[PDB]
Design a protein around this motif. Structure first.
Motif, PDB file in Angstrom:
ATOM      1  N   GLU A 220      16.747  21.115  -2.151  1.00 28.90           N
ATOM      2  CA  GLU A 220      17.919  21.960  -2.305  1.00 28.90           C
ATOM      3  C   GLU A 220      18.371  22.423  -0.930  1.00 28.90           C
ATOM      4  N   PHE A 221      19.677  22.351  -0.689  1.00 32.40           N
ATOM      5  CA  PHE A 221      20.255  22.690   0.602  1.00 32.40           C
ATOM      6  C   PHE A 221      21.484  23.556   0.391  1.00 32.40           C
ATOM      7  N   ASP A 222      21.834  24.322   1.421  1.00 32.45           N
ATOM      8  CA  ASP A 222      23.071  25.090   1.397  1.00 32.45           C
ATOM      9  C   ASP A 222      24.256  24.133   1.438  1.00 32.45           C
ATOM     10  N   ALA A 223      24.999  24.058   0.330  1.00 34.58           N
ATOM     11  CA  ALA A 223      26.059  23.063   0.216  1.00 34.58           C
ATOM     12  C   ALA A 223      27.201  23.333   1.185  1.00 34.58           C
ATOM     13  N   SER A 224      27.298  24.557   1.707  1.00 29.60           N
ATOM     14  CA  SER A 224      28.317  24.849   2.709  1.00 29.60           C
ATOM     15  C   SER A 224      28.043  24.110   4.011  1.00 29.60           C
ATOM     16  N   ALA A 225      26.773  23.837   4.308  1.00 31.17           N
ATOM     17  CA  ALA A 225      26.398  23.122   5.519  1.00 31.17           C
ATOM     18  C   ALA A 225      26.344  21.612   5.332  1.00 31.17           C
ATOM     19  N   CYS A 226      26.516  21.118   4.109  1.00 31.61           N
ATOM     20  CA  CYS A 226      26.375  19.700   3.814  1.00 31.61           C
ATOM     21  C   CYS A 226      27.704  18.973   3.677  1.00 31.61           C
ATOM     22  N   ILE A 227      28.817  19.599   4.066  1.00 36.22           N
ATOM     23  CA  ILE A 227      30.121  18.972   3.891  1.00 36.22           C
ATOM     24  C   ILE A 227      30.205  17.715   4.743  1.00 36.22           C
ATOM     25  N   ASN A 228      30.553  16.599   4.102  1.00 37.71           N
ATOM     26  CA  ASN A 228      30.629  15.286   4.743  1.00 37.71           C
ATOM     27  C   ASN A 228      29.313  14.960   5.453  1.00 37.71           C
ATOM     28  N   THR A 229      28.240  14.907   4.669  1.00 40.08           N
ATOM     29  CA  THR A 229      26.917  14.575   5.176  1.00 40.08           C
ATOM     30  C   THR A 229      26.216  13.669   4.177  1.00 40.08           C
ATOM     31  N   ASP A 230      25.452  12.711   4.694  1.00 42.59           N
ATOM     32  CA  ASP A 230      24.644  11.855   3.836  1.00 42.59           C
ATOM     33  C   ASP A 230      23.498  12.656   3.236  1.00 42.59           C
ATOM     34  N   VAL A 331       2.079 -10.779 -11.147  1.00 43.38           N
ATOM     35  CA  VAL A 331       3.123  -9.965 -11.752  1.00 43.38           C
ATOM     36  C   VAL A 331       2.595  -8.549 -11.914  1.00 43.38           C
ATOM     37  N   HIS A 332       3.418  -7.570 -11.551  1.00 43.80           N
ATOM     38  CA  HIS A 332       3.071  -6.166 -11.682  1.00 43.80           C
ATOM     39  C   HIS A 332       4.211  -5.429 -12.367  1.00 43.80           C
ATOM     40  N   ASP A 333       3.899  -4.240 -12.874  1.00 43.08           N
ATOM     41  CA  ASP A 333       4.915  -3.398 -13.482  1.00 43.08           C
ATOM     42  C   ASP A 333       5.854  -2.845 -12.413  1.00 43.08           C
ATOM     43  N   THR A 334       7.098  -2.590 -12.814  1.00 44.90           N
ATOM     44  CA  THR A 334       8.133  -2.208 -11.863  1.00 44.90           C
ATOM     45  C   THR A 334       8.898  -0.994 -12.373  1.00 44.90           C
ATOM     46  N   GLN A 335       9.459  -0.246 -11.422  1.00 42.17           N
ATOM     47  CA  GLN A 335      10.294   0.916 -11.700  1.00 42.17           C
ATOM     48  C   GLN A 335      11.298   1.066 -10.571  1.00 42.17           C
ATOM     49  N   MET A 336      12.529   1.407 -10.910  1.00 40.43           N
ATOM     50  CA  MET A 336      13.469   1.847  -9.888  1.00 40.43           C
ATOM     51  C   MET A 336      13.494   3.370  -9.848  1.00 40.43           C
ATOM     52  N   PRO A 337      13.352   3.984  -8.675  1.00 42.07           N
ATOM     53  CA  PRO A 337      13.357   5.449  -8.605  1.00 42.07           C
ATOM     54  C   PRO A 337      14.681   6.030  -9.084  1.00 42.07           C
ATOM     55  N   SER A 338      14.590   7.153  -9.791  1.00 37.89           N
ATOM     56  CA  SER A 338      15.783   7.817 -10.294  1.00 37.89           C
ATOM     57  C   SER A 338      16.428   8.664  -9.205  1.00 37.89           C
ATOM     58  N   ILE A 339      17.750   8.779  -9.277  1.00 33.94           N
ATOM     59  CA  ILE A 339      18.523   9.602  -8.356  1.00 33.94           C
ATOM     60  C   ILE A 339      19.344  10.588  -9.171  1.00 33.94           C
ATOM     61  N   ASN A 340      19.096  11.875  -8.960  1.00 38.11           N
ATOM     62  CA  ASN A 340      19.902  12.929  -9.553  1.00 38.11           C
ATOM     63  C   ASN A 340      20.359  13.879  -8.459  1.00 38.11           C
ATOM     64  N   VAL A 341      21.664  14.123  -8.412  1.00 35.02           N
ATOM     65  CA  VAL A 341      22.260  15.055  -7.465  1.00 35.02           C
ATOM     66  C   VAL A 341      23.156  16.006  -8.239  1.00 35.02           C
ATOM     67  N   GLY A 342      23.299  17.222  -7.733  1.00 33.86           N
ATOM     68  CA  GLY A 342      24.138  18.194  -8.403  1.00 33.86           C
ATOM     69  C   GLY A 342      24.195  19.481  -7.616  1.00 33.86           C
ATOM     70  N   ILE A 343      25.022  20.395  -8.112  1.00 34.92           N
ATOM     71  CA  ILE A 343      25.195  21.719  -7.530  1.00 34.92           C
ATOM     72  C   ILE A 343      24.513  22.723  -8.444  1.00 34.92           C
TER      73      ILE A 343
END
Lengths: 429, 84, 49, 50, 99, 49
Positions: A220-230, A331-343
């Motif tokens: 979690e980050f201060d969204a005021s400081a994250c404007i136009n940031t990766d 052969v091994h089991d596989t997973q793609m990591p989940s991505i969740n973003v929000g305010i």
DNA sequence: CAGGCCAA
DNA sequence: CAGGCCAA
DNA sequence: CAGGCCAA
DNA sequence: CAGGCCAA
């Protein structure tokens, strides 16, 4: 001696393709509200903890490549997805100046504004979670008050139609202008939800452990400081993601009487096995070799998975452990990591009279710019002089099938079991 | 200003393919003999001087690529032969 | 080429190609079989196989 | 030197196949946003753009 | 927007944008009626070069939508400027400028 | 040869309303926004006598 | 350029 | 010393 | 990254 | 601090 001939081998043509999309997503700062989900059939009664972290469907093929690209890729047998990368940039986060409750003077210039990033929550063995669409209260538009019946397939189909639009013959064509053409923002509606047991009607020994502290696993980050940031930059190399089945080999049974022979596998497992587990602990974990399966090319091919195109938006791109090849394979089991973003929800400036969480929130939107790249490769093998492309029989592929004939595929929609994504029967579209 | 969009243009995929063959040819050392060819329709009467120099059909597609390759190349619209 | 979002590949209309045709509908093509005329290979009507 | 309101805007067209008889083209729209430049207008105040 | 078929014009779908056309290809853009009338008295006149420089100033965004049933007013703005050079000449993007 | 003057289109992208819509789609309400563009133009001509 | 597939 | 002519 | 096509 | 568990 002058070598008039040398073993140049087969003619094989490999084609590498790249698929890029840019999406702009609007996310609601949903409040953290406990919702009751009544028991339904095999589903127990549970408590749901809503969040504002919108799911990013980067595990599906529609996210990277348009219907035209998908239809053309269908004409490239042997296509494997190689790598999928997603970059998420957040822009200025809007917060409502006032709540609209005329009976209070809650309007304020000042804002506390936080952006939540969650990588890999789906794989955490003890946080039972999934992405859900909520229904909201009219007086408090940012407060979930239930669940929409919209399923994951329907959600991803609607998101695809928002991304790419309808066909020109559709009467509803004007409703969804394509974001792939316009670049306009798309509202996301699918948010991370944390579950825990509901012991109100539980008989016997109750588990009263509350919720897991899921905020100890997110950024979690201060969204005021994250404007136009990766904020998210994740790459994924696919273990086995067959998008179109291999070229069928020339069947050796038409040439040889030895086609049904047996040879020693030694102590190596050349056939995959399906692990069945039971978190109720009624049954021990079970490993079953030689699960029912059938070929996706060749004389007895069952191409239902690739003709129902499950792999566009219904089923995730990676299917490692679902697909076998006829050779000495690991052969091994596989997973793609989940991505969740929000305010995070922004509380109203009202003063409540009790020591508790805020009960009113300002409207807030996250503005997320998503860059995604998908790399695929296909092959054109010429084992024979005539008749078109044919692959080696060691490139033959099988897919797990249920006994009723429905293809089995990996799904990222249900909560993990022991940190594993389950394999489930595909449903006919 | 941070360019949220830039003119990346269309998505176009270019595929380059190579076709190789090795052929062994036997040629007769034909004599240089004058042969008469009678007039036929629009063709006049002419004398023909035979040689032993066999033609190499390198100007045709079958010379470089097999029926399987030809049938597969049919499924690649926009294909141009670049160099032979 | 993907000029459009849906429906498969489509090229630009500037990539449209025409081929010489005879008035009877037989495509005209270059042939290296007949002798040259002024150092030129002729164009002739193709014959249906 | 006063401002003038412009009213003439770029419009992208595609075929309407609802009443089309025969082989329909269902290619949707071309991705025209892949051919334009876009910048954060907050950073472009008093800046040359064309 | 749907545009019904009219005579030789087929039925088509129209995708509206906010990118205003700049009429820099026309003579009135550069020279006033007095200048045009005087230039009429100079036979043999050729236009040699036309240059245009466009500068954007502060972009205004409404503080609120005016829908009283919602509290949508906000201080924060996401604000993007779109520039399109040579879209008219692209062979496969069939477009024109419309009111 | 054939000639063309390149087209120039400038504008502001529509700004969505801060309302929360219930469906995965494009915004259906937008704030009023204006682009303010200063245009400098020069035309050079030549004539002969 | 061979030995449990090769297009790894 | 070949590919729209060669004696260019 | 515009001007007679762009995938030259 | 993500991809078959994490307290390895």
């Amino acid at each position: 001696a002058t070598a008039i001939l040398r073993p140049i081998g087969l003619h094989v043509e490999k084609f590498q393709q790249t698929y890029r999309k840019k999406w702009r997503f609007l996310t609601s700062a949903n409040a953290n509200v406990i919702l009751a989900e009544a028991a339904s059939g095999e589903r127990p009664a549970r408590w749901a903890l809503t969040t504002g972290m919108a799911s990013i469907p980067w595990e599906y093929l529609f996210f990277y490549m348009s219907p035209a690209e998908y239809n053309r890729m269908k004409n490239y047998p042997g296509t494997f997805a190689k790598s999928a990368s997603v970059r998420i940039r957040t822009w200025n986060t809007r917060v409502a100046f006032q709540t609209g409750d005329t009976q209070t003077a809650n309007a304020t210039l000042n804002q506390n504004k936080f952006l939540q990033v969650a990588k890999g929550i789906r794989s955490i063995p003890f946080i039972c979670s999934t992405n859900r669409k909520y229904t909201y209260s009219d007086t408090e538009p940012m407060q979930p008050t239930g669940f929409a019946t919209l399923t994951s397939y329907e959600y991803r189909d609607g998101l695809k139609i928002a991304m790419y639009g309808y066909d020109n013959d559709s009467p509803d064509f004007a409703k969804k202008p394509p974001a792939d053409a316009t670049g306009a923002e798309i509202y996301l509606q699918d948010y991370l939800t944390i579950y825990t047991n509901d012991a109100r009607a539980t008989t016997g020994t109750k588990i009263l452990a509350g919720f897991p502290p899921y905020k100890n696993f997110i950024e979690e980050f201060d969204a005021s400081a994250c404007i136009n940031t990766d904020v998210v930059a994740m790459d994924y190399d696919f273990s086995y993601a067959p998008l179109v089945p291999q070229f069928a080999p020339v069947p050796n049974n038409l040439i040889t009487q030895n086609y049904n022979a047996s040879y020693p596998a030694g102590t190596k497992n050349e056939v995959t096995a399906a692990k069945t587990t039971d978190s109720s602990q009624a049954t021990p974990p079970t490993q079953v070799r030689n699960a029912p399966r059938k070929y996706i090319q060749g004389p007895n091919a069952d191409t239902t998975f690739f003709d129902e195109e499950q792999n566009y938006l219904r089923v995730p791109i990676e299917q490692g452990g679902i697909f076998e090849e006829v050779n000495v394979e690991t052969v091994h089991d596989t997973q793609m990591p989940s991505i969740n973003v929000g305010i995070r929800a922004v509380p109203k400036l009202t003063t409540i009279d009790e020591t508790t969480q805020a009960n009113s929130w300002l409207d807030a939107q996250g503005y997320f710019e998503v860059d995604c790249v998908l790399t695929t490769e296909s092959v054109d093998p010429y084992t024979y002089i005539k008749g078109g492309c044919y692959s080696a029989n060691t490139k033959s592929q099988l897919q797990y099938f249920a006994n009723d004939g429905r293809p089995i595929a990996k799904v990222y929609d249900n909560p993990n079991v022991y940190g594993r994504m389950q394999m489930i029967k595909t449903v006919k579209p």
